Amino acid sequence: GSHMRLNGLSPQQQQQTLATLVAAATATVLGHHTPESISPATAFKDLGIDSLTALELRNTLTHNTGLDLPPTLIFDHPTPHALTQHLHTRLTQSH
Ligand SMILES: *P(=O)(O)OCC(C)(C)[C@@H](O)C(=O)NCCC(=O)NCCSC(=O)CCCCCCC
């Protein structure tokens, strides 16, 4: 797990990856929408995320990160943006 062997990226270079991840993640749980078109400043609320699909989103981006993530993930930081930051820290600060 953790394809992060490409480490050495600047914050935003990782963030863009992650903003694409979480978007592709959420767009998959709901089975809709081009992930590239998922706006970071928008809330998963608006994107169509409920409580059940919240965890599925986490599940997806957790499987794509290879680390372990709290079931309160989406409960605490719901946005494509906020997860981008959290997962960024999870990848750089945590190994
Ligand atoms: P969930 O418990 O699985 O949601 C199903 C629910 C709330 C019982 C139904 O009423 C329903 O499908 N309506 C959803 C309305 C909402 O906007 N609620 C979404 C999640 S409720 C909640 O607060 C869970 C924590 C997630 C916080 C971010 C809100 C998406």
Domain boundaries, the chain: 1-95
The whole-angstrom separation of Cα 92 and Cα 54 is 24
Ligand 1 mean position, distance from CA 77 (Å)? 15
* Among 50, 56, 76, residue to substitute to test ligand 1 (most atoms within 8 Å of Cβ): 50
7 phi and psi angles, rounded to 5 deg: -60, 155
State which ligand 1 atom lies nearest to the alpha carbon of 49. 30
Instruction: Indicate the class that CATH gives domain 1-95.
Output: mainly alpha
Containing H/E element for 72? none
CB 51 within 8 A of CB 76: no
For ligand 1, say whether the CB of 45 is within 6 Å of any of its atoms.
yes
Q: If we measure between CA atoms, which residue out of 42, 70, 45, 46 comes closest to residue 58? A: 70
